[PDB]
Design a protein around this ligand. Structure first.
Ligand code: HEM
Ligand code: HEM
Ligand code: HEM
Ligand code: HEM
Lengths: 146, 141, 141, 146
């Protein structure tokens, strides 16, 4: 993955305004609601019975915070996403057997959350830069399948 | 399959676009061209730069097709049949690309209608656009 | 959408499986488990090794579902509705996986029925299995 | 991509029996018939109006021979598919803008052709080894998108 300096500036300027305690839970909760087969992997999380139950589930929020921290790490290492995500790839591919299409889906749910939270500031060029980021994260996470 | 709640959710959310329909369709197309440059090759006769009158006009057509699908959500294969023939037979659009425009339509709605874009409505809109996409990719032959 | 020729082609090809239906369903499952190991995790209660009586029995069930879809090809959403509920609601099967089993069913038919597996029939069978897959992934909620 | 020695043996033993003048045209022709949007890229090939026209089109056969030669090269360099496919990646991604899902589809059409041609010899373990091969070729061909 290829971000120009102007894209990197756009990406990191927005990211500095992200609430890192909340956005990862919003994205994970929306993944579980919008793509409900993904719930197969979260049986121990308890109540996922309704959108409100999912979004207010404290385990979704807490786990989402971990997910977002991994995205933050990718943002800090755009030129070595593979190294950055190696152990997470071993976990998600070799141990959990998550189909890697779902990595793309979660990246795109995060893009939708950023659009929702930033509104007109999430311009088409800013989105294009974030699509490069979430594509690179998904590809790195899927490395153990390649 | 769209539930009764999905149909209500999509109508209600789309209802809030009002006079901005064309504009949001145009914005979604721009978002797609910028984020997924492979899609540009279908429009060699358009300039795809910002403020393009051709993208503005096409966005009104895309929005009109989506309103047709909302208005005839229980008969979508029939409502979109001509468009399905066009995209598959004449234009040979790769089915992957419908997922890309659908995502960009979700992003555009999220960027303009934050009160409407709740997790439940997001899910309904995703199912709706996936159903539109299924119809528009149903005619390859 | 399946044309009249696609329906004829699928019936005719599947017609040649005869008493081997169960066996070919079982073989396709084995092909899927070996080629796409992520799919194995849905069957922790089965042994997936060659000659497994559990895979043999499941292959007969998969074949029976496909014959139902052939026999009711004009009403497939209805014919497969219970199975669609099972795969989405209870089993939470990832939609990607239907593409993998569909490919393995094509490979199995090609390996056993070379005279039937012409390019036109291949295309019909691919469209048929994609339509089955669309129905079986239509109920997520 | 990861092939064991027993998979490599299975793969290369079968490949030595492949008719290299015919199988690539059979796979490309079946791609154009089964996934007809792919015809968008072959307007200059002339008559693609029916399955028989496609399969007997001499340009399909000739172009298919080139495609299969690239697969043969990948088979000969399983541990550096990226280098092997670099210029083809630049062509198919940067110049032609082919969606990389189609690389997966063509690999799987080739698997179906091998099944058809080898019958019972195309055992489930032999298929699994060839799926690793066509996955690795598609991934290498898509490198310029990553
Ligand atoms: C872009 C995509 C994703 C990112 C960056 C990501 C990130 C992470 C992180 C940082 C962890 C915690 C690891 C820890 O405890 O050391 C995690 C755990 C896990 N993730 Fe993800 N994830 C991704 C996609 C997904 C998807 C799509 C699924 C399933 C649908 C999933 C399922 C899991 C599960 C079940 C665990 C818990 C594993 C355990 O504690 O044993 N992940 N993920
Ligand atoms: C939500 C999905 C989509 C909708 C509702 C939609 C809608 C439409 C509409 C209404 C037209 C005009 C039809 C004429 O004038 O009868 C059209 C044309 C067309 N569409 Fe789409 N479309 C969709 C997705 C796509 C995708 C994904 C692509 C390619 C990336 C695409 C490429 C085209 C092209 C190239 C034209 C013709 C442009 C003219 O040649 O000038 N469409 N579409
Ligand atoms: C052509 C596509 C498919 C067909 C026709 C099909 C058919 C069936 C049939 C008929 C049953 C038995 C239903 C019971 O006993 O009512 C079943 C069960 C099931 N299927 Fe499928 N299936 C398909 C694809 C898949 C896929 C892609 C997967 C996962 C990779 C899957 C996983 C399962 C599981 C896990 C069961 C239950 C097994 C039991 O818990 O013991 N199916 N399927
Ligand atoms: C696994 C996948 C594929 C392999 C290995 C492959 C291999 C090749 C080869 C070896 C060439 C000739 C390059 C030459 O003249 O130097 C070629 C040309 C081309 N390929 Fe593919 N291909 C793949 C997939 C595809 C797909 C999926 C499409 C479109 C659907 C496509 C479209 C093209 C076109 C249009 C050309 C001609 C380019 C030109 O002469 O300007 N290829 N491909």
């Amino acid at each position: 993955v290829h971000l120009t300096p102007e894209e990197k500036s756009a990406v990191t300027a927005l990211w500095g305004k992200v609430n890192v305690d909340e956005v990862g839970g919003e994205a994970l909760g929306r993944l579980l609601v919008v793509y409900p087969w993904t719930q197969r992997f979260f049986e121990s999380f308890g109540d996922l019975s309704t959108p409100d139950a999912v979004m207010g589930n404290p385990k979704v929020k807490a786990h989402g915070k971990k997910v977002l921290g991994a995205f933050s790490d990718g943002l800090a290492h755009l030129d070595n996403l593979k190294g950055t995500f190696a152990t997470l790839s071993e976990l998600h591919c070799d141990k959990l057997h998550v189909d890697p299409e779902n990595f793309r889906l979660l990246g795109n749910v995060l893009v939708c959350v950023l659009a929702h939270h930033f509104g007109k500031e999430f311009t088409p060029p800013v989105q294009a830069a974030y699509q490069k980021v979430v594509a690179g994260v998904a590809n790195a996470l899927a490395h153990k399948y390649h | 399959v769209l539930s009764p709640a999905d149909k209500t959710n999509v109508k209600a959310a789309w209802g809030k676009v009002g006079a901005h329909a064309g504009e949001y369709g145009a914005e979604a197309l721009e978002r797609m061209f910028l984020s997924f440059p492979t899609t540009k090759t279908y429009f060699p006769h358009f300039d795809l730069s910002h403020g393009s009158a051709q993208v503005k006009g096409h966005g009104k057509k895309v929005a009109d097709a989506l309103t047709n699908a909302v208005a005839h959500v229980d008969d979508m294969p029939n409502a979109l049949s001509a468009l399905s023939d066009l995209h598959a037979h004449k234009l040979r659009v790769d089915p992957v690309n419908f997922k890309l425009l659908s995502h960009c339509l979700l992003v555009t709605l999220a960027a303009h209608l934050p009160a409407e874009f709740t997790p439940a409505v997001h899910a309904s809109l995703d199912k709706f656009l996936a159903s539109v996409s299924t119809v528009l990719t149903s005619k390859y032959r």
